[PDB]
Design a protein around this nucleic acid. Structure first.
Lengths: 81, 1320
RNA sequence: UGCGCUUGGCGUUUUAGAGCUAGAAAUAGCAAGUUAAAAUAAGGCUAGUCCGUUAUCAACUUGAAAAAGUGGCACCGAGUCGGUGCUU
């Protein structure tokens, strides 16, 4: 719901989440999966909120595009509920 | 050549720009170092620095308190083992050595594989006589027979390892543990807070109703049954908060959104702190009693049984009820639902009973699994009621044991030792030594007890020996450590610097803020200013202006709020002696108590600091005065309030009750009183994130002056960011203001015209319900549906002050309905509608500033003082942090003295506001689209240097408003003209229209549509130099914003943090997991997963290959993890040789931190994210026309301009559509060049050719979404209309090895390219 | 703002709590389950009931460190910087 509830729900999922550019810049959330280069950042847009993109990317399943990130889209799915 | 420096400081980006006298950025050829062919590069003197935000040290501390946790809890077992070890080797000589080896496998274990007894015979017999330890822990209390010393240790070591909370100080008595006595403590605290509307639970059976065995709802509702308010009341929420529910304190306090609190959650102590931040800390004493009461409820759920040991027997009853119900449950599933017996009792993966016991589901995840299964089955009664009562098959160690006090674990402990004291001699001897191990709590005022090597320790020791719980009294100095505890934990004032601040609940501090608020009200005087304090504040904690209006202005005076002094009212109800508080001689007595009740929470140190006051009063007054602690810290020191003086002979606080001023010190003294740069940036009132921003801003300045030949600039303009700004809170705050303001008027505009909160974003629609559906000027109604042809008007016009906020907008039938003057609405318009503006006001629909500005013609209009104040709001930066930053630069650049020894202020450090540039942009159409690229930070810094230098060159007499230094302050008539253009280039006057950004304008627009022309050349008659040219200078600003080369540099940083993810994963046969200990291999023990990469290393050696074991030269990119960094930096060869590398060259090993830049073919760049993944390193520089086009097209409706200006804007978008086909043309060429994500570019080009018929703003707001494909950094997903383009990351870190490594500076001008193809 | 300090409850991991049967490597059919030790960033030492996820930064040279040291100007251009003088 409130973005702070999202950062906490993914910190409990062991992924090392920083909320960058929170000072008259376009806000973005950096989820460091892997802990090795792969970072799924989601920047804010005036039309679509940061959590509305978190659901529209992790609501309907793992998106099947990469071996490496699966335990992730799976774990990020349980937070859409 | 003369020049200036612009700067835009942020929490994660520092932009900079260099302008000359002609407002242009210059270019220079810089020396490229390295082994590359290119030895020259041309780079403009404008750019930005992007770095990761500085992190708060909260995460570090919460990990440190956990490190000290397991360190000290271990020593409390070592204390028990070290005490037992001697006389215990008689019984068993390998008991303990089997305990610390109980984690090892059979192969690794050196001793026998069974902990307690060693063999498989005597062990299984123990687990059947006592299946749980609570079985044996009760047996060691009831029996008088001798027990095995091994069983004695296991019981004592259990209740000492997990000893219980220290929420209660002394022993357990009914008025700190019983429901009835603790319930009344809650209702009494709630009462004092609200009077003449309190609850009075006179006749209520508290225990046999609230603490019964029923559901969390069947007990809260049954409580209010014998209490004819309702469940939604604030008291009903406190009981719901105590019974474990998740209530919502929004509707009770009427908040903006929802603030839900749950006592069982790990976030209550912080989610509650955000509640006291809005409702006020006065409620903290009330929520404390609810938490105090809740633990008494949970204890009765456990302690269900008068002597012996209640908890263990209660845990035995929980054990037996679990068995009789599981046998009950098994027989029902094995004879009524024969299918899915394996799913419930064997699966482990579907949250059955196996998932409850063997597979990781919580008690609630298991209740929700068999809830539809039990209800779909007969004979499940007496079980479903238990499942709803949250008391079914409960494991003996659950989450609610945090309500078990340590005195409970002390009673069973003392009972075991007492009935074994006469059997073993050392148990009789160490009966207190073992007891004290549990009961000891290292105090707050002592903390870490180091011997000297700790940056957190402050405690002194009376005798330098070893410290135990028993010798803590003799070894630890309680006074000297506490004296340093106060000295360290206190934070001094800014204004005075070595004068310690005051607690936020101090009397002299509360008196201060009471007078600072009162001294600026008027409808004052010193006569009854204090009589208000005495009659209003000193007796009523809340001064509703209603109270002041009739209990002071009727009774006294002549017939016709906020912070108070809570500590006065709090201390009043205790001692019941008003002569004590009002006496100014006992002030130092009242202050040290609040000081002692804010620092310490200890039982003995409170007395030692209050026993000096134990003769003022005795007993019944002291015990209540001690069990009442205060929290929080103020911002002022007593020496600032009642200490300093300007020679009047009266201090700041003395001025507040007579000759008012407010804290606007002037007429100077407060600022009248060298280090390292690490120390200057350390003690600034700012978050650690902005402290890094200041540091990079100082480094970027020292390198800009070195590039300029060590020639210090003329001026330096500074702009900061105001951090942590960042919907459902905004549009609801408008409704909450609209709803209440209508109910006060009572007019039914919501019933007649319903509106959803999302529809308030329309500026005109918000102004409708803001005006009760009426014209702000005419008595006539408003249209609701014809708001298009009806205009919004600015009360104080833009000609005087650029304000685009609600408190200066109105909504009228037409612009001309406000009058004919260029000022505010005239008295004609005032008289007709003034009575209705107050109707709007008392409803809090319009502000009092909006009301004062609407009725300015009644007071003569816009005074020269009102004009001069408008210059302060546009020019003076109110933030203290920005002034301290400009000090760091003025003290660094201007460090030269003459031989008369003044200071040669060489550089003028200018401090501007963030609005003057944004206004400058949206005025002359230099729009900004941040989503395109990171260039805007350089543009905001360039425009800052222009507005800063053009102001000081045009209005030099105002340098003491933004430039740093001791200058002349001027006054009202010193620069404000009388009227019109009187004394225009004649006398010292200079301003009439107070908008200082007007000398840039080509034609000024008044309120009545009139035109005020301005020349093309702007001069300064006192000198005559040209300061701005509306013909030649605007193209320079447009050309500078359009050049495609901007020094964008991502700051390389070595990663620092945890070693890996903190999931202690199960074991597996792969070597990927990290060893949890040096011997516990994950192949048979389970370890940590996914290590984080500190930095990467370009390895260049030879390895063994093939079946012939030959050598082969290789160039690799190995990543050095955080845990590996300690040894790799100590011996990189002996560490790399452990990975199969041999013949390692140390001069060709390269250190590659994160965001390391690499350039390949066709100018395409890549940033090194880690040793196995890359980031995008290119920036897309769109010209200035498309940014102006994308902004206007995106904001086609919300243009915030006059219809005479919106005409050109709307026709500029409708006469330049081809830009849309032009903009998409460049992103395609930029992605076919450097992005290298072709399949993703397939969809965005196909989705564009489809939506060529969609409205104008549709494609614009979706083309801005498209830059996410071409943005710098990590790839991310986006959506161009319906087609969801998913990202294409870069896991092929191989092409980097044969490229050009750009080692660039902080400013990007100084490069060092290392062509890695010559490496090998 | 910031920054420090005290305490608890679950958790997770490995081992202990012996499983019994007719069954060939597949697997049925039964009985059981509720907690105990230990670890809770690897570990580092000055061995303290103490430290060990904050801050701190390009490259190169000098230095234990703190830090000092290294890169010509001007015009005409602008798809990420060129192209074009002057001086050594």
């Amino acid at each position: 719901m409130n973005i702070n509830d999202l950062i906490r729900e993914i910190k409990n999922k062991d992924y090392t989440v920083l909320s960058g550019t929170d000072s008259n810049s376009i806000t973005q959330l950096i989820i460091r999966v892997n802990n090795d280069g792969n970072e799924y950042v989601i920047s804010e847009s005036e039309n679509e909120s940061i959590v509305e993109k978190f659901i529209s990317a992790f609501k309907n399943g793992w998106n099947q595009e990469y071996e490496d990130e699966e335990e992730f889209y799976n774990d990020m799915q349980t937070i859409t509920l | 050549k003369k020049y200036s420096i612009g700067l835009d400081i942020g929490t994660n980006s520092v932009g900079w720009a260099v302008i000359t006298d002609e407002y242009k950025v210059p270019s220079k050829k810089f020396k490229v170092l390295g082994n590359t062919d290119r030895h020259s590069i041309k780079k403009n003197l404008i750019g930005a620095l992007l770095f990761d935000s500085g992190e708060t040290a909260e995460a570090t501390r919460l990990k440190r308190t956990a490190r000290r946790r397991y360190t000290r809890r271990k020593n409390r077992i070592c204390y028990l083992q070290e005490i037992f070890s001697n006389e215990m080797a008689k019984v068993d000589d390998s008991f303990f050595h089997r305990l610390e080896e109980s984690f090892l496998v059979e192969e690794d274990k050196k001793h026998e594989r069974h902990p307690i007894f060693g063999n498989i015979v005597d062990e299984v017999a123990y687990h059947e006589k006592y299946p749980t330890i609570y079985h044996l822990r009760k047996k060691l209390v009831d029996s008088t027979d001798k027990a095995d010393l091994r069983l004695i240790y296991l019981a004592l070591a259990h209740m000492i390892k997990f000893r219980g909370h220290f929420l209660i100080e002394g022993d357990l008595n009914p008025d700190n543990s019983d429901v009835d006595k603790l319930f009344i403590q809650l209702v009494q605290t709630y009462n004092q807070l609200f009077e003449e509307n309190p609850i009075n639970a006179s006749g209520v059976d508290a225990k046999a109703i609230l603490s019964a065995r029923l559901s969390k709802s069947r007990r809260l509702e049954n409580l209010i049954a014998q209490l004819p308010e309702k469940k939604n009341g604030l008291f009903g929420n406190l009981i719901a908060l105590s019974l474990g529910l998740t209530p919502n304190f929004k509707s009770n306090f009427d908040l903006a959104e929802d603030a839900k609190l749950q006592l069982s959650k790990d976030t209550y102590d912080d989610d509650l702190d955000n509640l006291l931040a809005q409702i006020g800390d006065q409620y903290a004493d009330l929520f404390l009693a609810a938490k105090n009461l809740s633990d008494a409820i949970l204890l009765s759920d456990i302690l269900r049984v008068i002597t012996k040991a209640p908890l263990s027997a209660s845990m035995i009853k929980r054990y037996d009820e679990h068995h009789q119900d599981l046998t009950l449950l098994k027989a029902l599933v094995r004879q009524q639902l024969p299918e899915k017996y394996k799913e419930i009792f064997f699966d482990q993966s579907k949250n059955g009973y196996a998932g409850y016991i063997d597979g990781g589901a919580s008690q609630e995840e298991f209740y929700k699994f068999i809830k539809p299964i039990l209800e779909k089955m007969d004979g499940t009664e007496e079980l479903l009621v238990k499942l709803n009562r949250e008391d079914l098959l409960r494991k003996q160690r659950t989450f609610d044991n945090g309500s078990i006090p340590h005195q409970i674990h002390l009673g069973e402990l003392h009972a075991i030792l007492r009935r074994q004291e006469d059997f073993y001699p050392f148990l009789k001897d160490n009966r207190e030594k073992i007891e004290k191990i549990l009961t000891f709590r290292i105090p707050y005022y002592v903390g870490p007890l180091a011997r000297g090597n700790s940056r957190f320790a402050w405690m002194t020791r009376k005798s330098e020996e070893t410290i135990t719980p028993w010798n803590f009294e003799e070894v630890v100095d309680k006074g000297a450590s506490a004296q340093s505890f106060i000295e360290r934990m206190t934070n001094f004032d800014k204004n005075l610097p070595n004068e310690k601040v005051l607690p936020k609940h101090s009397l002299l501090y509360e008196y201060f803020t009471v007078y600072n608020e009162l001294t600026k009200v008027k409808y004052l005087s010193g006569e009854q200013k204090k009589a208000i304090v005495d009659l209003l504040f000193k007796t009523n904690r809340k001064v509703t202006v209603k109270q002041l209006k009739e209990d002071y202005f009727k009774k006294i005076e002549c017939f016709d709020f906020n912070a108070s002094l809570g500590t006065y009212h709090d201390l009043l109800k205790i001692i019941k002696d008003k002569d004590f508080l009002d006496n100014e001689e006992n002030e130092d007595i009242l202050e040290d108590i609040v000081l002692t009740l804010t620092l310490f929470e200890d039982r003995e140190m409170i007395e030692e600091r209050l026993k000096t006051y134990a003769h003022l009063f005795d007993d019944k007054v002291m015990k209540q005065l001690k069990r009442r602690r205060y929290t929080g810290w103020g911002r002022l020191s007593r020496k600032l309030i009642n200490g300093i003086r300007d020679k009047s002979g009266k201090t700041i606080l003395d001025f507040l009750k007579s000759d008012g001023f407010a804290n606007r010190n002037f007429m100077e003294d407060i600022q009248k009183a060298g280090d390292s740069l690490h120390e200057h940036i350390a003690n600034l009132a700012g978050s650690p994130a902005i402290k890094k921003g200041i540091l990079q801003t100082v480094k970027v300045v020292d390198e800009l002056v070195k590039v300029m030949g060590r020639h210090k600039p003329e001026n330096i303009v500074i702009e900061m960011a105001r951090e942590n700004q960042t919907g459902q809170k905004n549009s609801r705050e408008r409704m909450k203001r609209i709803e209440e303001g209508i109910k006060e008027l009572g007019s039914q505009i919501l019933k007649e015209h319903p509106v959803e909160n999302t529809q308030l974003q329309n500026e005109k629609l918000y102004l409708y319900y803001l005006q009760n559906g009426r014209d702000m000027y005419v008595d006539q109604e408003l249209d609701i549906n014809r708001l298009s042809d009806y205009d919004v008007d600015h009360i104080v016009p833009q000609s005087f002050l650029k304000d685009d906020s609600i408190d200066n907008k109105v909504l009228t039938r037409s612009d001309k309905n406000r009058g004919k003057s260029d000022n505010v609405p005239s008295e004609e318009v005032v008289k007709k509608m003034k009575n209705y503006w107050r109707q709007l006001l008392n409803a809090k629909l319009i502000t009092q500033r909006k009301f004062d500005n609407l009725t300015k013609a009644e007071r003569g209009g816009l005074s020269e003082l009102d004009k001069a104040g408008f210059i302060k709001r546009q020019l003076v930066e109110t933030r203290q942090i920005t002034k301290h930053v400009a000090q760091i630069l003025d003290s660094r650049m201007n460090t030269k003295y003459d031989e008369n020894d003044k200071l040669i202020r060489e550089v003028k450090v200018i401090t501007l506001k963030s609005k003057l540039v944004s206004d400058f942009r949206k005025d002359f159409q230099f729009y900004k689209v941040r989503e395109i690229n990171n260039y805007h930070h350089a543009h905001d810094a360039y425009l800052n240097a222009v507005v800063g230098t053009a102001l000081i060159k045009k209005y030099p007499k105002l340098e003491s408003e933004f430039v740093y230094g001791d200058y002349k302050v001027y006054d009202v008539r010193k620069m404000i003209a009388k009227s019109e253009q009187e004394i225009g280039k004649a006398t010292a006057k200079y301003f009439f229209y107070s908008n200082i950004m007007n000398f840039f304008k080509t034609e000024i627009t008044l309120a009545n549509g009139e035109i005020r022309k301005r020349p093309l050349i702007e001069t300064n008659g006192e000198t005559g130099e040209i300061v701005w040219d509306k013909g030649r200078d605007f193209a320079t600003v447009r050309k500078v914003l359009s050049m495609p080369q901007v020094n964008i540099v991502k700051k390389t940083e070595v990663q620092t943090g945890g070693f890996s993810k903190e999931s202690i994963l199960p074991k597996r046969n792969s070597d990927k997991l990290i060893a949890r200990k040096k011997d516990w291999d994950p192949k048979k023990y389970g370890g940590f997963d996914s290590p984080t990469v500190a930095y990467s290393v370009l390895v260049v050696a030879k390895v063994e290959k093939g079946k012939s074991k030959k050598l082969k030269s290789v160039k690799e990119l190995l990543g050095i993890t955080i845990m590996e960094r300690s040894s790799f930096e100590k011996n990189p060869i002996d560490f790399l040789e452990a990975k199969g590398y041999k013949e390692v060259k140390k001069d060709l090993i390269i250190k590659l931190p994160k965001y390391s830049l690499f350039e390949l073919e066709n100018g395409r760049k890549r940033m090194l994210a880690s040793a196995g993944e890359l980031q995008k390193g290119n920036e897309l520089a769109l010209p200035s026309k498309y940014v102006n086009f994308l902004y206007l097209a995106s904001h086609y409706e919300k243009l915030k301009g006059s219809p005479e200006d919106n005409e050109q804007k709307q026709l500029f978008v409708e006469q330049h559509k081809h830009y849309l086909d032009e903009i998409i043309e460049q992103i395609s060429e930029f992605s076919k060049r450097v992005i290298l994500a072709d399949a993703n570019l397939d969809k965005v080009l196909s989705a564009y050719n489809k939506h060529r018929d969609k409205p104008i703003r549709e494609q614009a707001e979706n083309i801005i979404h498209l830059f996410t494909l071409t943005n710098l950094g990590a790839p991310a997903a986006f959506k161009y209309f319906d087609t969801t383009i998913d990202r294409k990351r870069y896991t092929s870190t191989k092409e980097v090895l044969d490229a050009t490594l750009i080692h660039q500076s902080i400013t990007g001008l100084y490069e060092t390219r290392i062509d890695l193809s010559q490496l090998g």
